Swiss-Prot record:
<feature type="binding site">
    <location>
        <position position="83"/>
    </location>
    <ligand>
        <name>S-adenosyl-L-methionine</name>
    </ligand>
</feature>
<feature type="binding site">
    <location>
        <position position="78"/>
    </location>
    <ligand>
        <name>S-adenosyl-L-methionine</name>
    </ligand>
</feature>
<dbReference type="Pfam" id="PF02527">
    <property type="entry name" value="GidB"/>
</dbReference>
<feature type="binding site">
    <location>
        <begin position="129"/>
        <end position="130"/>
    </location>
    <ligand>
        <name>S-adenosyl-L-methionine</name>
    </ligand>
</feature>
<comment type="function">
    <text>Specifically methylates the N7 position of guanine in position 535 of 16S rRNA.</text>
</comment>
<keyword id="KW-0963">Cytoplasm</keyword>
<dbReference type="InterPro" id="IPR029063">
    <property type="entry name" value="SAM-dependent_MTases_sf"/>
</dbReference>
<keyword id="KW-0808">Transferase</keyword>
<dbReference type="GO" id="GO:0005829">
    <property type="term" value="C:cytosol"/>
</dbReference>
<protein>
    <recommendedName>
        <fullName>Ribosomal RNA small subunit methyltransferase G</fullName>
        <ecNumber>2.1.1.-</ecNumber>
    </recommendedName>
</protein>
<keyword id="KW-0489">Methyltransferase</keyword>
<dbReference type="GO" id="GO:0070043">
    <property type="term" value="F:rRNA (guanine-N7-)-methyltransferase activity"/>
</dbReference>
<dbReference type="InterPro" id="IPR003682">
    <property type="entry name" value="rRNA_ssu_MeTfrase_G"/>
</dbReference>
<keyword id="KW-0698">rRNA processing</keyword>
<keyword id="KW-0949">S-adenosyl-L-methionine</keyword>
<feature type="region of interest" description="Disordered">
    <location>
        <begin position="219"/>
        <end position="238"/>
    </location>
</feature>
<comment type="similarity">
    <text>Belongs to the methyltransferase superfamily. RNA methyltransferase RsmG family.</text>
</comment>
Length: 238
């Protein structure tokens, strides 16, 4: 239920002023997302104002709490539709963005999307996150690793923290309890992280709860993590 002006003015209030190019990039993103969503499952939400609020604005909220001007490289362990890293990339076009996804059909969408949007320095990798994080080339190589996921925090941490460089950040965009946070906290410590902040707020208009967790990579991840594809899900660290 967010119109273009509410989108534009909402971001302006948070220090993000969109150019005509950036605004056209979001229009194109919307068009392509809904078109490809006819071919494959990419989004549960297709009404334009809903997508602007729940995908674009929701993704960009990360930038309200972490300063993307101070970093260079992002890795997104995503749901295949580019959230939240691509809206962030549109807002912060200096960023080098990598997205890893397990479905090649979604990788194809992201490649076409990036080309249409004329994005520079984007890398899309068809891979299981468990496989990706063991690769010598990418392990502990990113300034910020983002994930907007339903995944249990303990599972998400195993997938994400091994990709964060020492002293970098893992930023988790979530919608909420005490039990999974507690298990999450223990996994985070095991994986070489330290929880810095949980920011709790509501999405505008809808007023639904959101939480963003910012975790600092304070030491190296043990070599055993991430475990083999499917192991984190079957037997989460905590």
């Amino acid at each position: 239920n967010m119109n273009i002006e509410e989108f534009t003015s909402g971001l302006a209030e948070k220090g993000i002023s969109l150019s005509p190019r950036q605004l056209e990039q979001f229009e194109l993103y919307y068009d392509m997302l809904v078109e490809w969503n006819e071919k494959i499952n990419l989004t549960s939400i297709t009404e334009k104002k809903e997508v602007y609020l729940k995908h674009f604005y929701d993704s960009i909220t990360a930038a309200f709490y972490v300063d993307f001007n101070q970093v260079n490289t992002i890795c997104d362990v995503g749901a295949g539709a580019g959230f939240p890293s691509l809206p962030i990339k549109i807002c912060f076009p200096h960023l080098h963005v990598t997205i890893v996804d397990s479905l090649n059909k979604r990788i194809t969408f992201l490649e076409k999307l990036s080309e249409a949007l004329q994005l520079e320095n984007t890398t899309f990798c068809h891979d299981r996150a468990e496989t990706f994080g063991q690769r010598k080339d990418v392990r502990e190589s990113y300034d910020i690793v983002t994930a907007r996921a339903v995944a249990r925090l303990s599972v998400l941490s195993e997938l994400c923290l091994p990709l964060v460089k020492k002293n970098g950040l893992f930023v988790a965009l979530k919608a909420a309890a005490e039990e999974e946070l507690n298990a999450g906290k223990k996994a985070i410590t095991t994986l070489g992280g330290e929880l810095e902040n949980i920011h709790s707020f509501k999405l505008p208009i809808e007023e639904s709860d959101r939480n963003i967790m910012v975790i600092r990579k304070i030491k190296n991840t043990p070599k055993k993590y991430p475990r083999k594809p499917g192991t984190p899900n079957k037997s989460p660290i905590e």
